[PDB]
Structures are given as C-alpha cells and as structure tokens.
Amino acid sequence: EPIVAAVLLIVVAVIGAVLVYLWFSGYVTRATSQAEQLSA
Amino acid sequence: EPIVAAVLLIVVAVIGAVLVYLWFSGYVTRATSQAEQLSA
Amino acid sequence: EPIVAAVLLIVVAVIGAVLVYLWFSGYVTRATSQAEQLSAAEQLKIEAVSKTGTTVSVNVRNVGEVPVKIASAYVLNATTLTMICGGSLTSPQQIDPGTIQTINVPGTCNLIAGARYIVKVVTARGTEAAATFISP
Amino acid sequence: EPIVAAVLLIVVAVIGAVLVYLWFSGYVTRATSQAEQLSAAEQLKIEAVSKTGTTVSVNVRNVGEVPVKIASAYVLNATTLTMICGGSLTSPQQIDPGTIQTINVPGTCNLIAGARYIVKVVTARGTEAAATFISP
Amino acid sequence: LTSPQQIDPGTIQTINVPGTCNLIAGARYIVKVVTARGTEAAATFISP
Amino acid sequence: EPIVAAVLLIVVAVIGAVLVYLWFSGYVTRATSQAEQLSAAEQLKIEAVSKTGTTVSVNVRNVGEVPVKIASAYVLNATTLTMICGGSLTSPQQIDPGTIQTINVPGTCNLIAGARYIVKVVTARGTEAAATFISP
Amino acid sequence: EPIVAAVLLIVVAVIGAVLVYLWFSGYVTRATSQAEQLSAAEQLKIEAVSKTGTTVSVNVRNVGEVPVKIASAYVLNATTLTMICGGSLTSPQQIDPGTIQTINVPGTCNLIAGARYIVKVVTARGTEAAATFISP
C-alpha cells in the first residue's frame, strides 16, 4: 500500500525535475546571452 | 476485510500525492520565477 | 431436527457470501480504477506574456498528452499572495496537447510600470502554472 | 456451521487479493514507465541568426539524440520579458538528430538598429533555447 | 456562514469569512474553509 | 434451535464491533493529534556573545513564534566534543517569541585567549543552536 | 452448538496469529539487520603508481576502518572505457585499515610513452578507485 504512494511521489519528483530543467535552460540561455552581449 | 481498508488507504495516499503535486507546482513556479527576476 | 436448521443456515451463509463477493468485486473495481485514473498528472507551462494597454495576454503551452481547460487567471502581488485583478473566465478555453492558446486575464486592472507582478493560470482540474514579468 | 461461512469468506478474500494484484501490476507498470519516459531530457542550441528585411531566420541544431519539433518562435524585449512579435508556426518543423533546420519567426515585426532583442524558440515538448543579437 | 454556499464541479465561487476581524500587516495568518461533509482546505497569506 | 444461538452470537459480535469502533476512534484521534503537534519545528539563533572575567554571557533570539525555555549551556572544545564547563541552569529561562534574553554559562571555567571554543545552548525540547568566538 | 465451533475457530485464529507474529519478528529482524549492515560504506585510494618494464605496480591505501580485499586491476583507455590489460588476480589480497599494499596488474600489456591510461582497482565488495599517470 505504501508502494503506490512511493510511485506517486517518484512521478511527482520526476515532473518537478522536468519543470526545473525547463526553467534552468531558459534562464541560463537568457543570462549567458545577456552577459556575452554586454561584454562588448 | 482488510483489503477494503487497504484500498481506502491507497486512495487517500493518491489524494495526498495529488495535493502535494498542486502545492509543489505552485511553489516551484512562484519561487523559481521570483529568484529568476531577482537575478536581474 | 436441528440438522435441517443447520443446513438452512449454511445455505443462507453461502448466499450471503455470494452477495458480499459480488459487491466486493464491484466496489474494488470502481474505486481502484478511479484511483488509477486520478493518479495521472497534468502539465502546463506559459511561454510568454504581453500587455496591450490595460489587458494582459498570456500564451499557454500544453506539454502534456491530455486536453486541458483554462478556467481562471490572476495577477498576484509580490510576496503577499494577494490578487489585484482576476476571476473566472467567461467561457473555459480548451488547449489541445502539443498546441498553444492565448488567455486574457478577466476584467480590467491598472498596472504600474517596473513593478513585481505574478501572472497565474489554473486548470479546471487544479494544476497551477505561472510566471513573472516587468510591466512596461 | 460457521466454518462453511468462514471458508467462503477466505475464498472471497483470496479472489479479491488476486484482483488487487492484477490491477497493482498493471498500474505500477504503466505509471512507472510513464515516469521513466517523461524523465528523459531534451537539449537544443541555436547556431546563428540572420535578418532579411523584416523577417528573422534562425538556424536550430538538434544536439540531442531524439527528433525535435519546433512549434513557436518569439522576439523578446530586454529585461521586461514582453514579446514584440511571435506566435504559432503555420506547420511544425521536424529536426532530425545531428542535423540543422531553418526557422522563421511568424508574422512581421519591425526592428530598430542597434537595439536589444532576445530570439527564442520552444519545442513541442517544451524545451527552451534562446540567445540575443544586434539588429542591423 | 449565514447560508451554506454550493460550488459546482469544475467551477469557482467566492467565500467571505463571517463577521469582522482586525488584522496586523506583515503578520502570519492561515485561512481555513470546511465543507458540510468535513473536508478541509486552507492556505496562508501576508496581510497587507 | 441453533437459530437463537446464531442471533445471540450476531448481537455479541455487533456489540464488540461497536466497542472496537469506540476505542479505534479515540486512539486514532489521540495518536494522530500527538503526531500532528510533535510535527512542529522549533528555531533558535544566538546573536552575539560576550566574556566578563570567567563568565560567558550569550544572547538568544527566537526567530520562531512559539515560547521557548533555555535549560543548559556548554563550552565545547574544538572537534573533540568534550565539554570544559556547563550543566543545567539553576532555573530555566523563558524567552518570548520575537524577543531576546541573556543566558550565562553555569559554573565558572577558565579560558585561554585566542583559543578555539564552541559555545552551545539547548532548548527544553532538545533543539540545538550555537556559535563560536575568539576568547579575549 | 455453533458456539463450540466459534470457540474452536477463535482458538485456531489465535494460534495462527501467534505463528504470524513469530515469523514476522524473525523476518523483520533478519532483513532489517541485513539492511543495516549493508548500509555501511567502504573507502579506498591509490597513492602512487610505478612502471617496471611492462608491469604496473600500484600502492593501495585503506583509508577506511574495515578490511578490504582487492580483486582486479585494469588499464583503461581514455574516454572509450575499453580495457587493454587486466583480469581477476591470481589470489585476492587483503589490505588492513590504516595500512598499505602493493598490487600488480595481472598479465602483461605494452604501453606507449606519453600516452593516456587509467589504472583502476576494484574491491571484492565492488568499491571502485582509480587514477591516471603518464607512461614513461
């Protein structure tokens, strides 16, 4: 019975990691590009 | 007879997992974007 | 003489057990499968936002595999979790998987340039997606 | 006499346990494999951009090993995260691994020479890749 | 509440806390609503 | 004739089930609420310390919101977790939430100038907060 | 008359519960303590390596506090994870905590001066330690 709860928790953690990855990619691109362009 | 109790417990655990999902999505989005905008 | 009553009692117990089994199968099936379906997850993300005058326009991306309905949108104040404008949409908007739609915050609310603003959209099922932007 | 009822109850409990086992195997399999498949990550990168008149062309390279579909492109304003032009592509464009493709920002948007602009492309699955350039 | 409020599935409704209570800005508060059947839902916010 | 015995047995089973219900409700309530209340967490932090002769004075501020009692203070040697002086205070000191109080290390212990010492205070509930300083 | 059968059924259920308790205690003890014992971690580090002709000698130090047995050594090619020489040792060598031992790579493998090589040692329990060196 706790196995089902563990599976749901794992799924939730995976989805949260995916969302974190999406935001991280967007932010790193925006920040890196801003820094590189203001380096001029 | 304990099988019914186990099924109810599994349903309750699933509901709790869904609630954790909702709160976690809201928190990760809000706090993540707040940190991203303070990065400016 | 009590033997007849005992046999009848055994028959009654058999019938009761059969009825209990029937209901047990039906109920475990319905509740178990309801839990199985509700275990599913819903995914949303908003690509970009734009403001025209006093109207806020948001594009919502359906990265999931199931249809999504948008029912409400808000403009939240920073660090206080208090809404300025928002409410139920006039008609829920359906967003197909792999597609995008435009969502307008209900009503009209004035905004201050350079302020911290949180735009938030909630699904009919309750999934939450949001972001922040600097009002021009 | 209660012994018969007890044996029948044990049998019914065994039947229910078998049914629960069947559903449990099916659900753990499907949900676990769904988590495994959504666990995968996707990476994109844009090599260079070019401007012809009022049209912006972006070259996107699939650095991942899986096919990519491009669904939208934007031109974001500096430090305010507000779109100037963008929207859904007329038809999604598929990018094979190890290859390159050309993506045009939908619609027509004017630009100012020497101004700041952020070019952004989003995948069908939701992956984000972007960069900046100086408009001629 | 003066009259119980019914909320249809898939919809939203506005609920006002009965009575009048003062608050302190920047203080901690949890707002809690209970169903007729007993279900509990709540959250916190920063009072303005 | 066995029917009467069966009916009485059913009545006895029903009464037993009612008793089990009563105790089960009471116990799940008490244990559940005990777990719920012990779930709460407690915070301490010490702002600064001062030395007068051979007495160490420590200021404790509760960043938490619940009442706190300070019961002991120690002076631990570096990386060996061996106390030089300390013990239970003569009377525990209650520090109100959002306020600060002064706590003195019990007893008298000598110090060496420029040495490595750890000053430590523990709550009535067992929460630990500490810091280090250069002995003058 | 059903009362006697009920009493016997209760006695049988109690005996079954006692048996379940006995096995449950035994199982929780053995499995839980096995998990506790396998929870422990193992540390190795190789201090330096030396080459004599075509034989590689590696000094392995047990920085941990438990005995260690060395089972194999390899010379891995750079970034391709393909071994050039290696295999199971003729006899496992035991390394006491706080001590050092010398391990020779099994077999004979030629090397190229100034080329890249990864020397790797593996324990009987599976703990992995390695380093690189410049072949003379």
XYZ file of C-alpha atoms in Angstrom:
672
model
C 0.000 0.000 0.000
C 2.846 2.472 0.684
C 4.281 1.283 -2.647
C 1.584 3.175 -4.562
C 2.326 6.329 -2.568
C 6.038 5.892 -3.302
C 5.306 5.537 -7.027
C 3.226 8.724 -6.986
C 5.997 10.528 -5.097
C 8.568 9.383 -7.669
C 6.337 10.575 -10.517
C 5.844 13.950 -8.817
C 9.595 14.323 -8.283
C 10.277 13.497 -11.940
C 7.763 16.089 -13.154
C 9.221 18.682 -10.790
C 12.707 17.923 -12.098
C 11.447 18.376 -15.666
C 9.966 21.778 -14.798
C 13.202 22.789 -13.057
C 15.171 21.732 -16.140
C 12.931 23.792 -18.432
C 13.294 26.933 -16.331
C 17.022 26.333 -15.874
C 17.579 26.078 -19.625
C 15.595 29.244 -20.291
C 17.331 31.239 -17.569
C 20.856 30.062 -18.387
C 20.354 30.946 -22.052
C 18.968 34.394 -21.221
C 21.674 35.197 -18.654
C 24.580 33.849 -20.719
C 23.440 35.740 -23.810
C 22.945 38.974 -21.847
C 26.408 38.682 -20.298
C 28.061 37.864 -23.629
C 26.372 40.776 -25.396
C 27.126 43.295 -22.632
C 30.747 42.106 -22.684
C 31.124 44.213 -25.839
C -11.890 -7.427 5.007
C -8.516 -5.668 5.459
C -8.471 -5.419 1.652
C -11.172 -2.731 1.748
C -9.169 -0.743 4.299
C -6.076 -1.110 2.114
C -7.978 0.193 -0.922
C -9.242 3.206 1.032
C -5.718 3.874 2.308
C -4.330 3.717 -1.238
C -6.997 6.172 -2.409
C -6.157 8.534 0.467
C -2.443 8.333 -0.345
C -3.175 9.117 -4.002
C -5.245 12.148 -2.975
C -2.413 13.367 -0.764
C 0.038 12.909 -3.626
C -2.196 14.999 -5.898
C -2.399 17.761 -3.281
C 1.395 17.691 -2.914
C 1.601 17.931 -6.713
C -0.565 21.056 -6.797
C 1.262 22.835 -3.982
C 4.690 21.841 -5.288
C 3.915 23.137 -8.773
C 2.666 26.440 -7.373
C 5.663 26.876 -5.076
C 8.321 25.859 -7.588
C 6.859 28.170 -10.227
C 6.469 31.201 -7.961
C 9.755 30.913 -6.055
C 11.715 29.964 -9.177
C 10.431 32.943 -11.158
C 10.984 35.271 -8.187
C 14.604 34.116 -7.972
C 14.960 34.485 -11.744
C 13.734 38.075 -11.652
C 15.948 38.975 -8.679
C 18.836 37.599 -10.753
C 18.494 40.729 -12.902
C -34.256 -31.976 13.637
C -31.633 -29.258 14.292
C -29.766 -30.691 11.287
C -32.331 -29.199 8.893
C -31.925 -25.788 10.526
C -28.138 -26.133 10.325
C -28.297 -26.951 6.605
C -30.596 -23.979 6.008
C -28.205 -21.740 7.946
C -25.312 -22.996 5.808
C -27.308 -22.221 2.653
C -28.096 -18.723 3.948
C -24.414 -18.164 4.728
C -23.474 -19.309 1.215
C -25.928 -16.876 -0.382
C -24.736 -14.039 1.845
C -21.116 -14.776 0.958
C -22.016 -14.728 -2.742
C -23.701 -11.330 -2.357
C -20.727 -9.967 -0.402
C -18.373 -11.229 -3.117
C -20.439 -9.569 -5.852
C -20.464 -6.196 -4.114
C -16.803 -6.535 -3.149
C -15.758 -7.121 -6.753
C -17.865 -4.217 -8.000
C -16.653 -1.756 -5.376
C -12.975 -2.700 -5.506
C -13.154 -2.403 -9.288
C -14.769 1.039 -9.352
C -12.712 2.592 -6.541
C -9.424 1.017 -7.628
C -9.840 2.161 -11.229
C -10.907 5.637 -10.078
C -7.660 5.850 -8.105
C -5.768 4.501 -11.123
C -7.085 7.223 -13.414
C -6.826 10.062 -10.885
C -3.177 9.111 -10.331
C -2.476 10.742 -13.709
C -0.605 14.048 -13.838
C -1.274 17.268 -15.740
C 1.434 19.541 -17.150
C 1.270 23.218 -18.122
C 3.759 25.950 -18.959
C 3.360 29.519 -20.224
C 5.740 30.644 -22.960
C 5.480 34.441 -22.934
C 3.190 37.275 -21.868
C 2.290 40.607 -23.439
C 0.382 43.694 -22.305
C -1.794 45.895 -24.528
C -2.997 48.951 -22.634
C -4.600 47.501 -19.503
C -5.154 43.972 -20.879
C -2.772 41.103 -20.093
C -2.385 38.388 -22.736
C -0.742 35.058 -21.884
C 0.206 32.161 -24.162
C -0.145 28.740 -22.512
C 1.739 25.720 -23.861
C 0.272 22.233 -23.405
C 3.309 19.988 -22.939
C 1.141 17.125 -21.681
C -0.718 14.428 -23.582
C -4.242 15.141 -22.276
C -6.617 18.014 -23.138
C -6.537 20.972 -20.756
C -9.171 23.585 -19.909
C -8.245 27.032 -18.589
C -10.800 28.410 -16.138
C -9.218 31.331 -14.261
C -6.307 33.763 -14.385
C -4.893 36.160 -11.794
C -2.329 38.928 -11.376
C -0.715 38.296 -7.986
C 1.165 40.864 -5.921
C 4.743 40.110 -4.919
C 5.480 38.381 -1.592
C 1.943 38.927 -0.249
C -0.110 36.410 -2.299
C -2.946 38.922 -2.727
C -4.751 39.275 -6.047
C -5.209 42.622 -7.775
C -7.430 41.515 -10.666
C -8.770 38.151 -11.743
C -11.670 35.760 -11.647
C -13.432 33.037 -13.569
C -13.196 33.280 -17.340
C -16.425 33.907 -19.227
C -16.033 30.586 -21.058
C -13.344 27.971 -20.325
C -10.747 27.651 -23.078
C -9.562 24.210 -24.178
C -5.902 23.710 -25.094
C -5.079 20.623 -27.142
C -1.875 18.670 -26.427
C 1.081 19.981 -28.389
C -0.750 23.241 -29.161
C -0.886 26.758 -27.727
C -3.655 29.230 -26.903
C -3.995 32.861 -25.846
C -5.549 33.642 -22.455
C -6.691 37.091 -21.314
C -6.956 37.973 -17.626
C -10.655 38.602 -16.855
C -11.719 42.167 -16.209
C -9.565 45.275 -16.396
C -6.907 46.186 -13.829
C -4.481 49.092 -13.888
C -0.779 48.302 -13.595
C 2.404 50.089 -12.516
C 5.497 50.014 -14.714
C 8.620 48.475 -13.218
C 6.676 46.616 -10.520
C 6.760 42.965 -9.490
C 3.749 41.139 -10.916
C 2.816 37.447 -10.965
C 0.525 36.153 -13.711
C -1.074 32.812 -12.866
C -3.348 30.356 -14.690
C -5.176 27.397 -13.135
C -6.681 24.375 -14.867
C -10.174 23.005 -14.374
C -8.570 20.017 -12.621
C -6.440 22.301 -10.422
C -2.955 22.253 -11.966
C -1.086 25.525 -11.431
C 1.261 27.334 -13.821
C 2.568 30.890 -13.587
C 5.492 33.269 -14.161
C 6.541 36.864 -13.508
C 7.115 39.832 -15.792
C 8.052 43.503 -15.527
C 5.208 45.735 -16.660
C 6.346 48.277 -19.310
C -21.889 -24.301 10.535
C -19.951 -21.007 10.793
C -16.994 -22.961 9.373
C -18.567 -23.001 5.901
C -19.092 -19.236 6.039
C -15.503 -18.736 7.212
C -14.146 -20.852 4.345
C -16.270 -18.925 1.845
C -15.030 -15.634 3.300
C -11.431 -16.838 2.949
C -12.119 -17.770 -0.679
C -13.648 -14.345 -1.367
C -10.659 -12.634 0.254
C -8.313 -14.676 -1.948
C -10.279 -13.666 -5.056
C -10.081 -10.013 -4.049
C -6.353 -10.313 -3.378
C -5.817 -11.762 -6.859
C -7.799 -8.902 -8.413
C -5.815 -6.316 -6.432
C -2.570 -7.985 -7.525
C -3.633 -7.844 -11.178
C -4.535 -4.160 -11.041
C -1.439 -3.357 -8.988
C 0.888 -4.952 -11.529
C -0.827 -3.156 -14.401
C -0.805 0.242 -12.710
C 2.724 0.081 -11.314
C 3.936 -0.921 -14.771
C 2.155 1.856 -16.661
C 2.850 4.648 -14.154
C 6.481 3.622 -13.637
C 7.128 3.502 -17.377
C 5.383 6.866 -17.818
C 7.744 8.316 -15.212
C 10.711 6.701 -16.984
C 9.697 8.177 -20.339
C 8.971 11.679 -19.014
C 12.300 11.506 -17.164
C 14.149 11.909 -20.468
C 15.701 15.308 -21.155
C 15.974 17.209 -24.424
C 18.665 19.705 -25.428
C 18.703 22.275 -28.239
C 21.067 25.023 -29.351
C 20.868 27.783 -31.965
C 23.954 28.404 -34.090
C 23.301 31.802 -35.677
C 20.530 34.153 -36.775
C 20.019 36.308 -39.852
C 17.716 39.205 -40.725
C 16.350 39.828 -44.231
C 14.161 42.914 -44.455
C 11.672 42.394 -41.624
C 11.945 38.581 -41.434
C 14.078 36.836 -38.802
C 15.576 33.449 -39.698
C 17.048 31.162 -37.028
C 19.124 28.013 -37.536
C 18.417 25.372 -34.876
C 20.662 22.339 -34.368
C 19.454 19.200 -32.580
C 22.300 18.372 -30.195
C 20.178 15.598 -28.694
C 19.631 12.078 -29.970
C 15.826 12.292 -30.356
C 13.746 14.077 -33.034
C 12.587 17.612 -32.254
C 9.525 19.554 -33.400
C 9.610 23.358 -33.362
C 6.229 24.930 -32.615
C 6.780 28.646 -31.941
C 9.334 31.444 -32.113
C 9.449 34.823 -30.372
C 11.436 38.058 -30.248
C 11.552 39.116 -26.595
C 12.194 42.624 -25.295
C 15.128 43.276 -22.984
C 14.695 42.991 -19.199
C 10.877 43.030 -19.402
C 10.070 39.584 -20.894
C 7.451 41.115 -23.206
C 7.020 39.797 -26.738
C 7.118 42.075 -29.773
C 6.279 39.522 -32.473
C 5.662 35.796 -32.457
C 3.082 33.062 -32.410
C 2.333 29.575 -33.630
C 4.211 28.356 -36.671
C 1.994 27.542 -39.641
C 3.244 23.941 -39.635
C 5.581 22.383 -37.041
C 9.076 21.713 -38.372
C 10.864 18.469 -37.511
C 14.604 18.489 -36.799
C 16.459 15.186 -37.043
C 19.310 14.439 -34.613
C 22.678 15.645 -35.839
C 21.049 17.924 -38.432
C 20.091 21.586 -38.798
C 16.952 23.420 -39.902
C 15.806 26.961 -40.664
C 13.048 28.564 -38.579
C 11.349 31.868 -39.415
C 9.637 33.961 -36.747
C 5.897 34.007 -37.564
C 4.400 37.278 -38.709
C 6.192 40.519 -39.495
C 7.676 42.783 -36.820
C 9.721 45.937 -37.292
C 13.065 46.348 -35.532
C 15.398 49.175 -34.515
C 19.067 49.023 -35.476
C 21.433 48.707 -32.534
C 18.636 47.724 -30.136
C 18.475 44.715 -27.831
C 16.381 41.696 -28.810
C 16.086 38.137 -27.493
C 15.265 35.435 -30.041
C 13.526 32.406 -28.546
C 12.371 29.030 -29.883
C 10.297 26.457 -27.992
C 9.923 22.753 -28.721
C 6.734 20.717 -28.870
C 7.726 19.027 -25.596
C 8.504 22.410 -24.012
C 12.303 22.670 -24.159
C 13.529 26.270 -24.356
C 16.605 27.627 -26.136
C 17.389 31.272 -26.841
C 20.098 33.892 -27.425
C 20.496 37.563 -28.335
C 21.649 39.517 -31.373
C 22.124 43.104 -32.532
C 19.626 44.072 -35.213
C 21.268 45.666 -38.308
C -21.936 31.121 7.392
C -25.311 32.814 7.017
C -26.281 30.406 4.224
C -24.166 27.464 3.007
C -22.711 28.034 -0.455
C -22.729 25.310 -3.109
C -19.793 25.049 -5.519
C -20.393 23.173 -8.766
C -17.706 20.812 -10.105
C -15.175 22.493 -12.355
C -16.270 25.978 -11.256
C -15.186 28.607 -8.735
C -17.002 30.537 -6.014
C -16.136 33.372 -3.633
C -16.458 32.866 0.130
C -16.321 35.670 2.703
C -15.195 34.960 6.263
C -18.172 35.549 8.599
C -18.002 38.519 10.926
C -15.351 41.220 11.075
C -11.828 40.705 12.421
C -8.897 43.104 12.520
C -5.524 42.055 11.114
C -1.910 43.165 11.507
C 0.156 43.944 8.423
C 3.071 41.581 7.929
C 1.627 39.053 10.387
C 1.009 35.339 9.940
C -2.478 34.101 9.060
C -3.999 30.855 7.797
C -7.449 30.985 6.198
C -9.432 27.760 6.516
C -12.698 26.597 4.934
C -14.564 23.400 5.828
C -17.202 21.513 3.859
C -20.551 20.243 5.075
C -19.099 16.721 4.873
C -15.967 17.844 6.742
C -13.323 18.190 4.016
C -10.620 20.702 4.947
C -8.742 23.133 2.694
C -6.603 26.115 3.674
C -3.527 28.238 2.903
C -1.605 31.235 4.247
C -1.120 34.808 3.080
C 0.579 38.027 4.166
C -1.905 40.589 5.434
C -1.450 43.981 3.675
C -32.792 -24.039 17.999
C -29.324 -23.143 16.638
C -31.016 -20.054 15.167
C -31.342 -18.495 18.630
C -27.661 -19.109 19.358
C -26.745 -17.624 15.974
C -28.814 -14.493 16.652
C -27.227 -14.020 20.079
C -23.786 -14.522 18.523
C -24.579 -11.853 15.920
C -25.681 -9.461 18.674
C -22.474 -10.126 20.626
C -20.384 -9.527 17.502
C -22.214 -6.249 16.839
C -21.574 -5.042 20.396
C -17.910 -5.993 20.085
C -17.660 -4.121 16.790
C -19.197 -1.056 18.448
C -16.606 -1.224 21.239
C -13.816 -1.601 18.668
C -15.202 1.448 16.849
C -15.222 3.499 20.052
C -11.647 2.668 21.007
C -10.412 2.967 17.427
C -11.834 6.468 17.051
C -10.417 7.565 20.399
C -6.955 6.130 19.797
C -6.570 7.256 16.188
C -7.630 10.722 17.331
C -5.172 10.946 20.225
C -2.181 9.420 18.410
C -2.886 11.359 15.211
C -3.086 14.677 17.049
C 0.041 13.850 19.069
C 1.951 13.219 15.838
C 0.467 16.369 14.289
C 1.592 18.565 17.174
C 5.048 16.988 17.540
C 5.467 17.589 13.800
C 6.075 21.264 14.609
C 9.643 22.545 14.356
C 11.472 25.000 16.592
C 14.159 27.562 15.737
C 16.910 29.245 17.755
C 19.823 31.515 16.918
C 22.309 33.349 19.142
C 23.125 36.878 18.004
C 26.356 37.571 19.891
C 28.368 36.543 22.943
C 30.434 38.441 25.494
C 33.048 37.490 28.087
C 33.375 39.151 31.505
C 36.190 37.736 33.619
C 35.493 33.997 33.654
C 31.749 34.254 32.911
C 30.328 33.867 29.397
C 27.107 35.701 28.520
C 25.100 34.645 25.458
C 22.149 36.463 23.886
C 19.470 34.177 22.423
C 16.827 35.399 19.973
C 13.903 33.204 18.908
C 13.292 33.595 15.186
C 10.396 31.215 15.810
C 6.909 32.074 17.007
C 6.429 29.669 19.947
C 7.560 30.116 23.580
C 10.988 28.663 24.348
C 12.775 27.620 27.545
C 16.575 27.552 27.778
C 17.823 24.781 30.060
C 21.572 24.308 29.535
C 24.702 25.873 28.067
C 28.155 24.440 27.368
C 31.628 25.386 26.156
C 32.846 22.585 23.884
C 36.463 22.016 22.895
C 37.357 22.051 19.211
C 36.489 18.928 17.199
C 36.614 16.624 20.241
C 33.059 17.306 21.513
C 34.261 17.380 25.126
C 32.806 19.989 27.465
C 35.044 22.147 29.641
C 32.266 23.779 31.675
C 28.494 23.607 31.650
C 25.426 21.999 33.115
C 21.762 22.502 33.839
C 20.829 26.068 34.706
C 19.584 26.788 38.216
C 16.228 27.944 36.827
C 15.216 27.558 33.161
C 14.745 30.869 31.363
C 11.701 31.503 29.176
C 12.351 33.638 26.095
C 9.291 35.117 24.404
C 8.908 34.846 20.613
C 10.370 37.809 18.775
C 12.361 38.904 21.840
C 15.873 38.319 23.169
C 17.329 37.330 26.537
C 20.722 36.866 28.178
C 21.942 33.394 29.171
C 25.008 32.779 31.346
C 27.034 29.564 31.242
C 26.551 27.753 34.581
C 29.537 27.488 36.876
C 32.967 29.007 36.365
C 35.504 27.809 33.793
C 38.849 29.318 32.846
C 39.617 30.379 29.276
C 42.743 30.884 27.171
C 42.998 33.984 24.995
C 42.923 33.361 21.260
C 41.779 29.750 21.667
C 39.220 27.753 19.702
C 35.983 27.327 21.683
C 32.374 26.459 20.822
C 29.540 27.906 22.916
C 26.320 25.885 22.777
C 22.772 26.264 24.132
C 19.986 23.660 24.073
C 16.231 24.117 24.412
C 13.856 22.327 26.752
C 12.636 20.322 23.742
C 16.184 19.496 22.595
C 16.649 21.967 19.731
C 20.299 22.946 19.289
C 21.780 26.335 18.398
C 25.345 27.538 18.877
C 28.219 29.638 17.513
C 31.932 30.232 18.070
C 34.070 33.169 19.151
C 37.649 34.211 19.881
C 38.295 34.276 23.612
C 39.904 37.616 24.640
C -23.828 -25.817 19.155
C -22.419 -23.149 16.797
C -20.871 -21.636 19.942
C -18.423 -24.543 20.242
C -17.411 -24.177 16.595
C -16.970 -20.435 17.132
C -14.713 -21.044 20.143
C -12.584 -23.520 18.186
C -12.378 -21.036 15.308
C -11.230 -18.319 17.724
C -8.566 -20.652 19.132
C -7.355 -21.502 15.619
C -7.221 -17.808 14.706
C -5.226 -17.006 17.853
C -2.717 -19.774 17.109
C -2.375 -18.536 13.536
C -1.792 -15.005 14.808
C 0.938 -16.293 17.131
C 2.626 -18.069 14.212
C 2.384 -14.914 12.084
C 3.938 -12.922 14.936
C 6.780 -15.426 15.277
C 7.695 -15.323 11.600
C 7.176 -11.559 11.422
C 9.625 -10.970 14.267
C 12.158 -13.304 12.673
C 11.832 -11.699 9.239
C 11.880 -8.087 10.406
C 14.955 -8.878 12.492
C 16.936 -10.618 9.752
C 16.014 -8.316 6.855
C 16.268 -5.095 8.862
C 19.664 -6.004 10.306
C 20.903 -7.102 6.868
C 19.900 -3.694 5.511
C 21.619 -2.003 8.459
C 24.833 -3.951 7.854
C 24.888 -3.375 4.084
C 24.257 0.337 4.693
C 27.958 0.709 5.551
C 30.332 2.353 3.073
C 33.882 1.497 2.024
C 36.784 3.817 1.165
C 39.889 3.256 -0.958
C 42.565 5.445 -2.505
C 45.673 4.662 -4.554
C 48.661 6.759 -3.508
C 51.028 6.418 -6.468
C 51.908 4.097 -9.338
C 55.180 2.818 -10.762
C 56.080 1.074 -14.018
C 58.820 -1.562 -14.296
C 59.304 -2.780 -17.853
C 55.805 -3.881 -18.865
C 54.467 -4.439 -15.323
C 52.423 -1.806 -13.480
C 52.632 -1.667 -9.679
C 50.028 0.306 -7.719
C 50.014 1.112 -3.999
C 46.537 0.969 -2.437
C 45.872 2.504 0.982
C 42.899 1.555 3.155
C 41.781 4.942 4.468
C 38.679 3.209 5.804
C 38.234 1.327 9.058
C 37.063 -2.047 7.678
C 39.164 -4.764 5.982
C 39.409 -4.597 2.191
C 40.124 -7.282 -0.413
C 41.460 -6.389 -3.867
C 40.129 -8.477 -6.753
C 41.249 -6.966 -10.074
C 43.239 -4.201 -11.734
C 42.839 -2.693 -15.204
C 44.493 -0.174 -17.515
C 41.637 1.678 -19.212
C 41.922 3.586 -22.473
C 40.918 7.239 -22.408
C 37.223 8.092 -22.841
C 36.386 4.776 -24.541
C 36.121 2.625 -21.379
C 37.832 -0.305 -23.110
C 40.466 -2.268 -21.214
C 43.884 -3.037 -22.676
C 45.073 -5.470 -19.996
C 43.513 -6.767 -16.811
C 41.516 -9.501 -15.178
C 40.977 -11.336 -11.929
C 44.056 -11.560 -9.737
C 45.560 -14.966 -9.014
C 44.731 -14.605 -5.311
C 42.840 -11.718 -3.666
C 44.987 -9.502 -1.448
C 43.713 -8.245 1.907
C 44.501 -4.676 2.977
C 44.193 -3.845 6.668
C 42.784 -0.470 7.766
C 45.428 2.217 8.098
C 47.952 0.167 6.097
C 49.217 -0.027 2.516
C 49.743 -2.821 -0.009
C 51.227 -3.256 -3.477
C 49.069 -4.601 -6.315
C 50.342 -5.733 -9.722
C 48.120 -5.576 -12.801
C 47.513 -9.172 -13.968
C 49.085 -10.228 -17.231
C 51.450 -8.236 -19.416
C 50.391 -5.263 -21.543
C 52.605 -2.978 -23.599
C 52.332 0.793 -23.216
C 53.230 3.885 -25.241
C 55.298 6.613 -23.600
C 53.407 9.855 -23.095
C 50.037 8.215 -23.792
C 46.892 8.352 -21.680
C 45.976 5.474 -19.369
C 43.610 4.992 -16.427
C 44.638 2.469 -13.771
C 41.720 1.098 -11.758
C 41.353 -1.221 -8.757
C 38.138 -2.929 -7.637
C 37.273 -4.470 -4.280
C 35.601 -7.788 -3.574
C 32.536 -5.811 -2.450
C 32.647 -3.626 -5.578
C 34.155 -0.357 -4.326
C 35.970 1.477 -7.120
C 39.155 3.563 -7.014
C 41.374 4.760 -9.851
C 43.808 7.401 -11.130
C 45.837 8.289 -14.219
C 49.545 8.505 -14.975
C 51.984 9.390 -17.745
C 53.635 6.267 -19.116
C 57.465 6.628 -19.168
